[PDB]
Amino acid sequence: GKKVLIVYAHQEPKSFNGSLKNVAVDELSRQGCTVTVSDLYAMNFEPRATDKDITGTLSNPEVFNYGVETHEAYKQRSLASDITDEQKKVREADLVIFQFPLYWFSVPAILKGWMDRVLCQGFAFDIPGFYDSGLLQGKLALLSVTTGGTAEMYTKTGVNGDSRYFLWPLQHGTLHFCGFKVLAPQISFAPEIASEEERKGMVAAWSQRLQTIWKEEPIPCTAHWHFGQ
Amino acid sequence: AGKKVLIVYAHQEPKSFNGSLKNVAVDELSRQGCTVTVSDLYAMNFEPRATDKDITGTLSNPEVFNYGVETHEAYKQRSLASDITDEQKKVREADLVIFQFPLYWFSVPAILKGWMDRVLCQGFAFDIPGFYDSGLLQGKLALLSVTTGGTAEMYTKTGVNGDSRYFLWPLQHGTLHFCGFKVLAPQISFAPEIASEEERKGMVAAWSQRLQTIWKEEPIPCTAHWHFGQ
Numbered sequence: 001g002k003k004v005l006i007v008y009a010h011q012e013p014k015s016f017n018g019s020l021k022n023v024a025v026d027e028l029s030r031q032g033c034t035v036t037v038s039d040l041y042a043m044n045f046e047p048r049a050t051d052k053d054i055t056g057t058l059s060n061p062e063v064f065n066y067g068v069e070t071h072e073a074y075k076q077r078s079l080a081s082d083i084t085d086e087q088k089k090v091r092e093a094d095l096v097i098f099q100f101p102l103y104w105f106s107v108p109a110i111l112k113g114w115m116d117r118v119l120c121q122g123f124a125f126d127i128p129g130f131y132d133s134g135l136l137q138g139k140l141a142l143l144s145v146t147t148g149g150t151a152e153m154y155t156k157t158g159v160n161g162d163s164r165y166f167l168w169p170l171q172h173g174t175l176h177f178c179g180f181k182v183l184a185p186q187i188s189f190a191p192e193i194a195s196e197e198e199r200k201g202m203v204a205a206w207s208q209r210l211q212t213i214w215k216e217e218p219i220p221c222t223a224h225w226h227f228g229q
Numbered sequence: 230a231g232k233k234v235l236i237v238y239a240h241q242e243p244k245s246f247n248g249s250l251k252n253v254a255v256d257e258l259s260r261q262g263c264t265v266t267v268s269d270l271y272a273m274n275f276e277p278r279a280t281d282k283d284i285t286g287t288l289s290n291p292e293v294f295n296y297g298v299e300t301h302e303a304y305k306q307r308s309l310a311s312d313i314t315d316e317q318k319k320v321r322e323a324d325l326v327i328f329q330f331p332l333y334w335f336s337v338p339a340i341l342k343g344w345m346d347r348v349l350c351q352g353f354a355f356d357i358p359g360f361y362d363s364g365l366l367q368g369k370l371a372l373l374s375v376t377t378g379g380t381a382e383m384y385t386k387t388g389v390n391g392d393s394r395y396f397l398w399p400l401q402h403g404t405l406h407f408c409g410f411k412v413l414a415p416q417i418s419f420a421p422e423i424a425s426e427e428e429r430k431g432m433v434a435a436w437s438q439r440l441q442t443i444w445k446e447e448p449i450p451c452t453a454h455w456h457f458g459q
């Protein structure tokens with residue numbers, strides 16, 4: 001049996017991102033996987049890291065330190081319910097798929113907020129430890145991203161540089177840090193420019209890849225993979 | 230001529246190390262006679278989510294909502310939400326934009342990511358074409374003032390986090406350079422939580438000292454070579 005969490009960040013159900021999320025739900029559901037979707041915009045997910053994330057009284061109510069307060073609230077089971085609901089979905093998942101349009105070579109702020117607030121100290125990592133000692137060890141993560149820019153722009157000699165360059169903070173700094181094994185990203189380049197046929201072909205390539213997702217090996221999530229030859 | 234500075238600040242606590250770096254920036258630039266504005270994102274309860282609430286008028290396509298298309302059209306028509314246009318006015322007037330923030334997941338905190346997503350809209354910060362050296366914010370300077378949990382040693386080529394320049398790429402190149410900003414060398418204050426009282430005071434004083442000569446600095450070559458070598 002396999003459990004999948006899809007963290008989805010798009011405002012429009014009829015969008016290309018919406019179609020990629022729906023095809024993921026359809027394919028994984030067909031296989032018999034347990035599937036859950038966290039539709040961040042539909043949930044009006046709170047992205048700001050604030051004192052509202054801790055219930056009851058604070059460890060130090062005179063000087064607010066977000067990381068210290070959330071770490072202590074995690075251990076004392078005093079985190080806001082919106083955070084703990086996401087943590088329960090992550091804890092149960094074997095695979096976490098992030099479905100999003102690229103915003104400023106990164107995730108939209110609503111999804112950045114999910115990472116900031118859900119992946120807290122004590123839950124996803126400790127100080128120490130992280131990376132191979134990360135608390136989410138054994139889990140798989142996959143970034144499914146759509147861009148405005150073409151594939152040619154996202155090349156070593158392209159104006160945007162190699163697409164692997166923008167993946168570093170997400171794949172290494174976040175996912176690998178928490179102990180996830182990272183599967184090769186799914187990048188759907190410039191669907192807004194692409195024809196109806198090319199767009200259908202991009203969602204079919206995603207559905208086809210999902211058919212054998214459990215047979216995939218993770219990438220070596222290293223500086224060499226992201227920046228070297 | 231008189232210089233205008235916008236500080237986009239993202240920390241919940243005024244007594245924080247970030248708070249002290251922002252205050253020292255305000256003090257030093259104010260002493261020099263600069264015009265200074267601070268956008269304190271958490272105190273403003275700044276909306277980070279990119280939604281249909283960011284447009285006030287008739288949507289260009291109300292059946293299929295496309296955020297970038299809708300905000301581009303709303304910018305041109307002057308139907309964007311007032312919280313966005315208030316920030317755009319601060320950016321338009323600034324000669325230098327300083328971003329003061331703790332590093333969150335090798336990036337900006339989500340509240341600041343939201344400022345970038347919503348404020349730097351098509352028509353205002355860039356156009357297609359009209360990006361990188363043709364960006365609409367050409368002539369402006371930007372500077373990232375970052376604090377980390379990780380030590381300087383961790384942020385080296387052979388360190389567990391890799392070179393600090395690696396995480397700067399989406400912010401400096403993908404965002405600031407793309408909008409036409411000339412990027413000044415980042416200010417990175419490594420691990421203030423671990424550092425002694427003397428080392429902490431030293432990092433604050435190095436920032437204050439650097440600001441004394443900020444108008445004499447040249448921007449970095451914001452290229453893949455500067456960030457990644459080889």
Ligand SMILES: Cc1cc2nc3c(=O)[nH]c(=O)nc-3n(C[C@H](O)[C@H](O)[C@H](O)COP(=O)(O)OP(=O)(O)OC[C@H]3O[C@@H](n4cnc5c(N)ncnc54)[C@H](O)[C@@H]3O)c2cc1C
Pocket residue numbers: 010014015016017018019100101102103104105106146147148149150191192196199200203279293295296297345346347403
């Ligand atoms: C704040 C902001 C920052 C951005 N920063 C960047 C950046 O740094 N780099 C970059 O490259 N881009 C950037 N972009 C662009 C952004 O990444 C793209 O606009 C986005 O990825 C397009 O994906 P979408 O799902 O929204 O496309 P859509 O506009 O929803 O999809 C395109 C078309 O596909 C159609 N479609 C939907 N489902 C299907 C289907 N099943 N079969 C066929 N066609 C279908 C839709 O009807 C539509 O006509 C940014 C945009 C914004 C708003």
Ligand SMILES: Cc1cc2nc3c(=O)[nH]c(=O)nc-3n(C[C@H](O)[C@H](O)[C@H](O)COP(=O)(O)OP(=O)(O)OC[C@H]3O[C@@H](n4cnc5c(N)ncnc54)[C@H](O)[C@@H]3O)c2cc1C
Pocket residue numbers: 049065066067115116117173240244245246247248249330331332333334335336376377378379380421422426429430433
């Ligand atoms: C969601 C999240 C994600 C994170 N991700 C990362 C990551 O990817 N990488 C990473 O490296 N770190 C990460 N961190 C850690 C974070 O970057 C640091 O905690 C932060 O940079 C510390 O800065 P601060 O202002 O909060 O420090 P503080 O805790 O406020 O400051 C440390 C000390 O400095 C003192 N101080 C304040 N002002 C002065 C002054 N004027 N003179 C002397 N001492 C002073 C304070 O009193 C305190 O004792 C993450 C944290 C969170 C919450």
Ligand SMILES: COc1ccc(C2=Nc3ccc(OC)cc3C2=O)cc1
Pocket residue numbers: 104148149150190193297357
């Ligand atoms: C054929 O030439 C093209 C096609 C698409 C784009 C892009 N559309 C975008 C839309 C929005 C963004 O936000 C920063 C960034 C981008 C691009 O880079 C640029 C050039």
Ligand SMILES: COc1ccc(C2=Nc3ccc(OC)cc3C2=O)cc1
Pocket residue numbers: 067127177334378379380420423
């Ligand atoms: C040898 O001493 C240290 C001290 C602090 C840290 C760090 N604190 C942090 C706090 C929160 C984070 O979020 C991912 C990331 C980090 C670090 O990397 C790492 C090693």
Ligand SMILES: [Zn+2]
Pocket residue numbers: 171172173176220221222
């Ligand atoms: Zn890695």
Ligand SMILES: [Zn+2]
Pocket residue numbers: 401402403406407450451452
């Ligand atoms: Zn650049």
